Write a protein that binds this ligand. Structure first.
Ligand code: MG
Ligand code: MG
Ligand code: MG
Ligand code: MG
Ligand code: MG
Ligand code: MG
Ligand code: MG
Ligand code: MG
Ligand code: MG
Ligand code: MG
Ligand code: MG
Ligand code: MG
Ligand code: MG
Ligand code: MG
Ligand code: MG
Ligand code: MG
Ligand code: MG
Ligand code: MG
Ligand code: MG
Ligand code: MG
Ligand code: MG
Ligand code: MG
Ligand code: MG
Ligand code: MG
Ligand code: MG
Ligand code: MG
Ligand code: MG
Ligand code: MG
Ligand code: MG
Ligand code: MG
Ligand code: MG
Ligand code: MG
Ligand code: MG
Ligand code: MG
Ligand code: MG
Ligand code: MG
Ligand code: MG
Ligand code: MG
Ligand code: MG
Ligand code: MG
Ligand code: MG
Ligand code: MG
Ligand code: MG
Ligand code: MG
Ligand code: MG
Ligand code: MG
Ligand code: MG
Ligand code: MG
Ligand code: MG
Ligand code: MG
Ligand code: MG
Ligand code: MG
Ligand code: MG
Ligand code: MG
Ligand code: MG
Ligand code: MG
Ligand code: MG
Ligand code: MG
Ligand code: MG
Ligand code: MG
Ligand code: MG
Ligand code: MG
Ligand code: MG
Ligand code: MG
Ligand code: MG
Ligand code: MG
Ligand code: MG
Ligand code: MG
Ligand code: MG
Ligand code: MG
Ligand code: MG
Ligand code: MG
Ligand code: MG
Ligand code: MG
Ligand code: MG
Ligand code: MG
Ligand code: MG
Ligand code: MG
Ligand code: MG
Ligand code: MG
Ligand code: MG
Ligand code: MG
Ligand code: MG
Ligand code: MG
Ligand code: MG
Ligand code: MG
Ligand code: MG
Ligand code: MG
Ligand code: MG
Ligand code: MG
Ligand code: MG
Ligand code: MG
Ligand code: MG
Ligand code: MG
Ligand code: MG
Ligand code: MG
Ligand code: MG
Ligand code: MG
Ligand code: MG
Ligand code: MG
Ligand code: MG
Ligand code: MG
Ligand code: MG
Ligand code: MG
Ligand code: MG
Ligand code: MG
Ligand code: MG
Ligand code: MG
Ligand code: MG
Ligand code: MG
Ligand code: MG
Ligand code: MG
Ligand code: MG
Ligand code: MG
Ligand code: MG
Ligand code: MG
Ligand code: MG
Ligand code: MG
Ligand code: MG
Ligand code: MG
Ligand code: MG
Ligand code: MG
Ligand code: MG
Ligand code: MG
Ligand code: MG
Ligand code: MG
Ligand code: MG
Ligand code: MG
Ligand code: MG
Ligand code: MG
Ligand code: MG
Ligand code: MG
Ligand code: MG
Ligand code: MG
Ligand code: MG
Ligand code: MG
Ligand code: MG
Ligand code: MG
Ligand code: MG
Ligand code: MG
Ligand code: MG
Ligand code: MG
Ligand code: MG
Ligand code: MG
Ligand code: MG
Ligand code: MG
Ligand code: MG
Ligand code: MG
Ligand code: MG
Ligand code: MG
Ligand code: MG
Ligand code: MG
Ligand code: MG
Ligand code: MG
Ligand code: MG
Ligand code: MG
Ligand code: MG
Ligand code: MG
Ligand code: MG
Ligand code: MG
Ligand code: MG
Ligand code: MG
Ligand code: MG
Ligand code: MG
Ligand code: MG
Ligand code: MG
Ligand code: MG
Ligand code: MG
Ligand code: MG
Ligand code: MG
Ligand code: MG
Ligand code: MG
Ligand code: MG
Ligand code: MG
Ligand code: MG
Ligand code: MG
Ligand code: MG
Ligand code: MG
Ligand code: MG
Ligand code: MG
Ligand code: MG
Ligand code: MG
Ligand code: MG
Ligand code: MG
Ligand code: MG
Ligand code: MG
Ligand code: MG
Ligand code: MG
Ligand code: MG
Ligand code: MG
Ligand code: MG
Ligand code: MG
Ligand code: MG
Ligand code: MG
Ligand code: MG
Ligand code: MG
Ligand code: MG
Ligand code: MG
Ligand code: MG
Ligand code: MG
Ligand code: MG
Ligand code: MG
Ligand code: MG
Ligand code: MG
Ligand code: MG
Ligand code: MG
Ligand code: MG
Ligand code: MG
Ligand code: MG
Ligand code: MG
Ligand code: MG
Ligand code: MG
Ligand code: MG
Ligand code: MG
Ligand code: MG
Ligand code: MG
Ligand code: MG
Ligand code: MG
Ligand code: MG
Ligand code: MG
Ligand code: MG
Ligand code: MG
Ligand code: MG
Ligand code: MG
Ligand code: MG
Ligand code: MG
Ligand code: MG
Ligand code: MG
Ligand code: MG
Ligand code: MG
Ligand code: MG
Ligand code: MG
Ligand code: MG
Ligand code: MG
Ligand code: MG
Ligand code: MG
Ligand code: ZN
Lengths: 118, 204, 59, 131, 122
RNA sequence: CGAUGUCGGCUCGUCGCAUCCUGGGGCUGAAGAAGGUCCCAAGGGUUGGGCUGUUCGCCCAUUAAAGCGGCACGCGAGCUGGGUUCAGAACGUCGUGAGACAGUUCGGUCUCUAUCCGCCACGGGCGCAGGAGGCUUGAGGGGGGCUCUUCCUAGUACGAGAGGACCGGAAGGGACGCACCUCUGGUUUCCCAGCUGUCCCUCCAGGGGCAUAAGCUGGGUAGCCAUGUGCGGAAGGGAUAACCGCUGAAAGCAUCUAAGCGGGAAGCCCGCCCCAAGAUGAGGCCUCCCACGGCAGCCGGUAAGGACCCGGGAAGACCACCCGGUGGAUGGGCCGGGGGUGUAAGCGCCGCGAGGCGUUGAGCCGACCGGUCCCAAUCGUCCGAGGUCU
RNA sequence: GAAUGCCGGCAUGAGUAACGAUAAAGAGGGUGAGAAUCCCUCUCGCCGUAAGCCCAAGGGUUCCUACGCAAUGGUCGUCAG
RNA sequence: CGUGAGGGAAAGGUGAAAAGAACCCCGGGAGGGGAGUGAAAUAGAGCCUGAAACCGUGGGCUUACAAGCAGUCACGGCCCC
């Protein structure tokens, strides 16, 4: 049973999963769009979205909170000076995940794309 | 044998005569009468009820024409109360008064594929003293060459729950008609938001 | 355990009968509304990069 | 429907607002309606609320006391009609929401670990002045 | 929630200090005794020269438990130990004083003389 | 004997009845209560411990009762391995010896993958003469079936006294079963905080990794849960067993019987709960669609409908099932509430300092109850009747 | 036609068990007919009385570079002992 | 294979002649389709002949209420000549 349990496990133990989400947050906040498997892509949405919202509040507290996950001050400066301002009136939905057509050759993994939104 | 269709909203406990009474709250009213089962037409007596209005776009053609035949709005659920012929075209919580005893049918919570210890309260195996990978296993399932087979109805692993269960002789604790609300003392099958059926009890 | 083993060779018929559920179902494919190419529904068109009426990918 | 609202509506008729707020570490006196024979009386139970288990109308609090050499704990529904009233005896201050650890402490150590919450003691005396 | 093997304190002045439950006298096979239930115990420790002494096979009613008991008012109570009081075959206390509080459930189940002797009933 | 694994235990049942208990009887050297003995009855039940490998048995504490037997002394491709049952060792005994002993003693490798039948669960197919969406009848199955205490009757009938009922009527238990999470109590792998060592970001402050597959510690939502909660055994109707009668010959009497008619069990049939029309004997009701073209057959195009795909789901191994797909609140986000945690950072003030006080129940914050089209369920595709004959 | 015969071929079990330490991965960029698997960058994890370095046995070209991928590599391969 | 003494295999055939398939087409290659050689190309080198087991594609008959050492006797249907 799994009744009303939220969150994927992705066959990673607790800290490998947290690292997975964090690293994916760096790559997304860096390049603006990345390609992953559909399931990882669906889970990245809420993890990055939260960090962006904190970038909107913009206070010092938020920046240290965000730095717990992203660690990279340069990147956080980008999230605060560049990324977050283009979302001032957009309440939620800072990312989107669109499934891609062709599976990955070696293991059949269904892929999608995750990006920040205009 | 009156009866009503319902939703299981949730549990709490009320205080009645310096006594915490665990209850389950049921949103039962109101149920439009949709079709009547008569002995001349169908061979038995029952009342087909309806519950929860439906987005009329979502009601396909054969269902639609079934509602119009007995002028009624589109409803999400049809169910029958066997041997019940109420005089109006609508069934509401008013057919129960507090102090009455009821039976409640719902779909139990589904355990999926369930082991023999969870499904049948088997005792499993020892957890030490050399017990070898049989800690939750069934044990023997038979005899030897006589009968050389396993009984029908053997209790084994399989799907457990998400099945129709009726709990019998539950006390109606209060009836709040302004909210189509029925309080019943004790536990009722299924998850919150579950379809349930509340009938007058079969226990004298 | 005591190494359970097949008692008889399976017959050509029984083995092929077991395989009566092994056929593939073909890919479900719709036309991309812009380049008309067949593609899986609910995927970004891999031929022209259009999805929901706009260019999303270089291709 | 709003199942949460429906339940909050069932509960509403029994909700209670006469009782004074408290925290884990406060010493409290619960005046409790008790039956025995052939009567019913009010038995005062006094001790440290060691736990406030929150669930709305259903929250409960657990008070711990010594009664003639023996530890006694009492769990109360915060909206029970059997509670006549609650008297804040003393404002403790914890660093912790559950104070189970005081079950294993001498009376000396409990006193050292649950000191007077001067802030909320003053807060009480301040707004203890009515027209 | 007392079962065989369970050690209980002795809340009276009989001489016993510890008894080990060997039976829940409640039907043919009850698993547990609580407040108001009667047990058969063996005296595992006694102060010198009391009515009861080590080795004795005595009867006792559970007067407080460490498992919390639930009351119809929807509240519950719980004590720091498991204690009992030695009785004769009429439920009457074989000692002449009882120490510490006792559950009010003793009253309903007819252990009136222990309840009065109790310094507190909770 | 080109192997049918051997005791006991655990687990899991199932059956017999020569019945241990509960139910119904007759006889009693049956006053009552309690027994004895035989008959009927297998629905249910038949406890926990000390000893011993033990079966058995004895004992302790209870019990309504602690029944006896079958199923390869039921069950080692289910577990155990104490015993027995190899190779070591020793004792007693026997043998000059080597060695020997259902004599004792200590130790001593029990094999991941289930083909077929069988069993538990779940689908796929085709059928059920048109094709569909629903709702249903219940043939036939399964499940359940226990029992104790106290009180009232009444300290009455009965008995010199001790004691002590029937019938009928209340209440409260034990074990068992189904369901549940309001309370009680667990878990809660990252929801919060505290702490050590170390390395790092960035020097401070503040943080991050690692110390487990949570580093450790204190707490803990939803869920899943029992120790927690509700409910179940019935009631009732029918037919019976032993047993008791009514009326009544054969056989002027007599006789429960030969004609006929009563009474009568926890047992039997129904009644309760669950499954069920593959019930091919394929049932029934309500509604929807239709006489489409080309040549009981065939080729397509549509209908009613369905499936595909996708967002999901206290549903779930896959499958199935259930909801939703912009006509939208389905998941994600965000907002409010709940809930946990227990007063963040930063700044100010006190202190030499560790810290402390204030801002501040702060800040963080999974799942729970909702709101909100910000993000994603885009766009679509394929199936699918024209109704055999008397 | 049988010798649990001999040699060889080919079935069944079966798309089943398994793919060899639970130290762990993610993305971007390049190469290419083809890339989870090769190269490069950034991030994350693991060893650190070694899972790092040197020497002796033993092995005998496995070393370096270019060019390749049929087989070998438990998948893949543009990479490689 | 075994430390060693020692053990100890499998594996023959295009065609008369290489005339061993220029060139083109798909393909990264393998492979194939044409063209071409040959009396012959399922003689194309994985090459004479090419049985059987085993695997597949096409067609006829037949099969989803049925109990089987799978055949046999009878009758009927359908297909074929
Ligand atoms: Mg499940
Ligand atoms: Mg699990
Ligand atoms: Mg969800
Ligand atoms: Mg998580
Ligand atoms: Mg999940
Ligand atoms: Mg998931
Ligand atoms: Mg995991
Ligand atoms: Mg995996
Ligand atoms: Mg992994
Ligand atoms: Mg983990
Ligand atoms: Mg870790
Ligand atoms: Mg890790
Ligand atoms: Mg998509
Ligand atoms: Mg796809
Ligand atoms: Mg690949
Ligand atoms: Mg239902
Ligand atoms: Mg199990
Ligand atoms: Mg269980
Ligand atoms: Mg169960
Ligand atoms: Mg067990
Ligand atoms: Mg166990
Ligand atoms: Mg054991
Ligand atoms: Mg072992
Ligand atoms: Mg073993
Ligand atoms: Mg083993
Ligand atoms: Mg184990
Ligand atoms: Mg087993
Ligand atoms: Mg056997
Ligand atoms: Mg047989
Ligand atoms: Mg199911
Ligand atoms: Mg009420
Ligand atoms: Mg629920
Ligand atoms: Mg085994
Ligand atoms: Mg075995
Ligand atoms: Mg096996
Ligand atoms: Mg094993
Ligand atoms: Mg095996
Ligand atoms: Mg075999
Ligand atoms: Mg064949
Ligand atoms: Mg074959
Ligand atoms: Mg075949
Ligand atoms: Mg098969
Ligand atoms: Mg292109
Ligand atoms: Mg709620
Ligand atoms: Mg409301
Ligand atoms: Mg008092
Ligand atoms: Mg105190
Ligand atoms: Mg009051
Ligand atoms: Mg004491
Ligand atoms: Mg033999
Ligand atoms: Mg053999
Ligand atoms: Mg053999
Ligand atoms: Mg053999
Ligand atoms: Mg054999
Ligand atoms: Mg038996
Ligand atoms: Mg008999
Ligand atoms: Mg009897
Ligand atoms: Mg009797
Ligand atoms: Mg008598
Ligand atoms: Mg007598
Ligand atoms: Mg008798
Ligand atoms: Mg008799
Ligand atoms: Mg029986
Ligand atoms: Mg039976
Ligand atoms: Mg029996
Ligand atoms: Mg015993
Ligand atoms: Mg002992
Ligand atoms: Mg022992
Ligand atoms: Mg024993
Ligand atoms: Mg024994
Ligand atoms: Mg035996
Ligand atoms: Mg013996
Ligand atoms: Mg007794
Ligand atoms: Mg008896
Ligand atoms: Mg036997
Ligand atoms: Mg045998
Ligand atoms: Mg024998
Ligand atoms: Mg024997
Ligand atoms: Mg045996
Ligand atoms: Mg036996
Ligand atoms: Mg056996
Ligand atoms: Mg074995
Ligand atoms: Mg055995
Ligand atoms: Mg066996
Ligand atoms: Mg075997
Ligand atoms: Mg077996
Ligand atoms: Mg066997
Ligand atoms: Mg054993
Ligand atoms: Mg042994
Ligand atoms: Mg031994
Ligand atoms: Mg022995
Ligand atoms: Mg031995
Ligand atoms: Mg031996
Ligand atoms: Mg040997
Ligand atoms: Mg030996
Ligand atoms: Mg030996
Ligand atoms: Mg000797
Ligand atoms: Mg001898
Ligand atoms: Mg001898
Ligand atoms: Mg001699
Ligand atoms: Mg001698
Ligand atoms: Mg011999
Ligand atoms: Mg011997
Ligand atoms: Mg022997
Ligand atoms: Mg013998
Ligand atoms: Mg011998
Ligand atoms: Mg040893
Ligand atoms: Mg031995
Ligand atoms: Mg083997
Ligand atoms: Mg296998
Ligand atoms: Mg099988
Ligand atoms: Mg077979
Ligand atoms: Mg089917
Ligand atoms: Mg199907
Ligand atoms: Mg047909
Ligand atoms: Mg049948
Ligand atoms: Mg029936
Ligand atoms: Mg039946
Ligand atoms: Mg009386
Ligand atoms: Mg009675
Ligand atoms: Mg009862
Ligand atoms: Mg809850
Ligand atoms: Mg709880
Ligand atoms: Mg609770
Ligand atoms: Mg709790
Ligand atoms: Mg965290
Ligand atoms: Mg650190
Ligand atoms: Mg530093
Ligand atoms: Mg620092
Ligand atoms: Mg590190
Ligand atoms: Mg680690
Ligand atoms: Mg940590
Ligand atoms: Mg610690
Ligand atoms: Mg914890
Ligand atoms: Mg806890
Ligand atoms: Mg929780
Ligand atoms: Mg329980
Ligand atoms: Mg009960
Ligand atoms: Mg007569
Ligand atoms: Mg007659
Ligand atoms: Mg009669
Ligand atoms: Mg009769
Ligand atoms: Mg009579
Ligand atoms: Mg009768
Ligand atoms: Mg009964
Ligand atoms: Mg049904
Ligand atoms: Mg049908
Ligand atoms: Mg049906
Ligand atoms: Mg039939
Ligand atoms: Mg039908
Ligand atoms: Mg019908
Ligand atoms: Mg359509
Ligand atoms: Mg799913
Ligand atoms: Mg539906
Ligand atoms: Mg749909
Ligand atoms: Mg659509
Ligand atoms: Mg649309
Ligand atoms: Mg939504
Ligand atoms: Mg939402
Ligand atoms: Mg929220
Ligand atoms: Mg809140
Ligand atoms: Mg709060
Ligand atoms: Mg502060
Ligand atoms: Mg602060
Ligand atoms: Mg200063
Ligand atoms: Mg200050
Ligand atoms: Mg919140
Ligand atoms: Mg959130
Ligand atoms: Mg809206
Ligand atoms: Mg939108
Ligand atoms: Mg389209
Ligand atoms: Mg021969
Ligand atoms: Mg052979
Ligand atoms: Mg062989
Ligand atoms: Mg053989
Ligand atoms: Mg051979
Ligand atoms: Mg041969
Ligand atoms: Mg051979
Ligand atoms: Mg061979
Ligand atoms: Mg094979
Ligand atoms: Mg498979
Ligand atoms: Mg298999
Ligand atoms: Mg498998
Ligand atoms: Mg596998
Ligand atoms: Mg591996
Ligand atoms: Mg492994
Ligand atoms: Mg490990
Ligand atoms: Mg790349
Ligand atoms: Mg690339
Ligand atoms: Mg690759
Ligand atoms: Mg590749
Ligand atoms: Mg590289
Ligand atoms: Mg490390
Ligand atoms: Mg070091
Ligand atoms: Mg060398
Ligand atoms: Mg070498
Ligand atoms: Mg070489
Ligand atoms: Mg070199
Ligand atoms: Mg080289
Ligand atoms: Mg190299
Ligand atoms: Mg190279
Ligand atoms: Mg290669
Ligand atoms: Mg390759
Ligand atoms: Mg290759
Ligand atoms: Mg080559
Ligand atoms: Mg290879
Ligand atoms: Mg390879
Ligand atoms: Mg390998
Ligand atoms: Mg290359
Ligand atoms: Mg290599
Ligand atoms: Mg050798
Ligand atoms: Mg060699
Ligand atoms: Mg040799
Ligand atoms: Mg040879
Ligand atoms: Mg040769
Ligand atoms: Mg030649
Ligand atoms: Mg030649
Ligand atoms: Mg020639
Ligand atoms: Mg090419
Ligand atoms: Mg080309
Ligand atoms: Mg070529
Ligand atoms: Mg070709
Ligand atoms: Mg060619
Ligand atoms: Mg030619
Ligand atoms: Mg010629
Ligand atoms: Mg010729
Ligand atoms: Mg030829
Ligand atoms: Mg030829
Ligand atoms: Mg020739
Ligand atoms: Mg040839
Ligand atoms: Mg050939
Ligand atoms: Mg064929
Ligand atoms: Mg039939
Ligand atoms: Mg047929
Ligand atoms: Mg025949
Ligand atoms: Mg014939
Ligand atoms: Zn396109």
């Amino acid at each position: 049973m799994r009744h009303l349990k939220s969150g994927r496990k992705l066959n990673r133990h607790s800290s490998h999963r947290l690292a997975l989400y964090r690293n994916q947050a760096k790559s997304l906040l860096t390049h603006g769009r990345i390609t992953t498997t559909v399931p990882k892509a669906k889970e990245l949405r809420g993890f990055v979205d939260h960090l962006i919202h904190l970038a909107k509040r913009g206070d010092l507290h938020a920046r240290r909170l965000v730095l717990r996950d992203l660690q990279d001050v340069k990147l956080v400066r980008k999230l605060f000076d560049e990324i977050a301002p283009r979302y001032r009136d957009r309440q939620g939905g800072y990312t989107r995940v669109l499934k891609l057509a062709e599976r990955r050759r070696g293991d059949g993994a269904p892929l999608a794309l995750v990006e920040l939104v205009e | 044998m009156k009866g009503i269709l319902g939703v299981k909203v949730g549990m709490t406990r009320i205080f009645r005569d310096d006594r915490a009474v665990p209850v389950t709250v049921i949103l039962a009213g109101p149920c439009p009468v949709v079709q009547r089962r008569t002995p001349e037409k169908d061979g038995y007596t029952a009342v087909q009820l309806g519950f929860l209005p439906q987005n009329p776009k979502r009601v396909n053609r054969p269902l639609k024409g079934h509602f119009a035949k007995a002028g009624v709005e589109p409803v999400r659920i049809l169910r029958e109360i066997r041997d019940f012929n109420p005089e109006g075209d609508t069934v509401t919580v008013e057919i129960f008064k507090p102090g009455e005893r009821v039976d409640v049918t719902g779909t139990s919570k589904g355990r999926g594929f369930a082991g023999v210890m969870k499904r049948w309260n088997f005792a499993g195996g020892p957890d030490s003293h050399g017990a070898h990978k049989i800690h939750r296993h069934p044990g023997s399932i038979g005899n030897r060459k006589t009968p050389g087979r396993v009984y029908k109805g053997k209790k084994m692993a399989g799907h457990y729950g998400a099945e129709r269960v009726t709990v019998m002789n539950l006390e109606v604790v209060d009836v709040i008609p302004e909210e189509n609300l029925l309080l019943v003392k004790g536990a009722v099958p299924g998850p919150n938001g579950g379809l349930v059926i509340v009938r007058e009890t079969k226990k004298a | 355990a005591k190494h359970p083993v097949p008692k008889k060779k399976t017959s050509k018929a029984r083995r092929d009968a077991r395989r009566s559920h092994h056929a593939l179902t073909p890919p479900t494919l719709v036309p991309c509304p812009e380049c008309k190419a067949m593609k899986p529904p609910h995927t970004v068109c891999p031929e022209c990069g259009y999805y929901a009426g706009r260019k999303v990918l270089e291709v | 429907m709003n199942r949460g609202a429906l339940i909050k509506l069932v509960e509403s008729r029994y909700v209670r607002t006469d009782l004074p707020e408290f925290r884990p570490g406060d010493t409290v006196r619960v005046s409790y309606k008790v039956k025995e024979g052939n009567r019913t009386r009010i038995q005062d139970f006094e001790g440290i609320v060691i736990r406030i288990r929150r669930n709305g109308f259903n929250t409960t609090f657990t008070v711990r006391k010594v009664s003639y050499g023996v530890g006694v704990e009492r769990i109360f529904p915060l909206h029970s009609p059997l509670i006549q009233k609650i008297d804040i005896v003393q404002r403790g201050r914890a660093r912790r929401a559950k104070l189970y650890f005081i079950r294993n402490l001498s009376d000396r150590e409990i006193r050292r670990k649950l000191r007077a919450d001067r802030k909320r003691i003053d807060q009480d005396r301040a707004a203890e002045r009515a027209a | 929630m007392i079962q065989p093997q369970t050690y209980l304190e002795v809340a009276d002045n009989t001489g016993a200090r510890k008894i080990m439950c060997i039976r829940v006298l409640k039907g043919s096979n009850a698993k547990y005794a609580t407040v108001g239930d009667v047990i058969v115990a063996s005296v595992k420790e006694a102060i010198p020269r009391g009515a009861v002494k080590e080795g004795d096979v005595v009867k006792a009613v559970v007067v407080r438990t460490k498992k919390e008991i639930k009351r119809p008012d929807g509240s519950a109570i719980r004590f720091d130990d498991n204690a009992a009081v030695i009785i004769n075959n009429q439920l009457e206390p074989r000692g002449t004083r009882v120490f510490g509080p006792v559950a009010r459930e003793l009253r309903e189940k007819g252990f009136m003389k222990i309840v009065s002797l109790a310094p507190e009933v909770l």
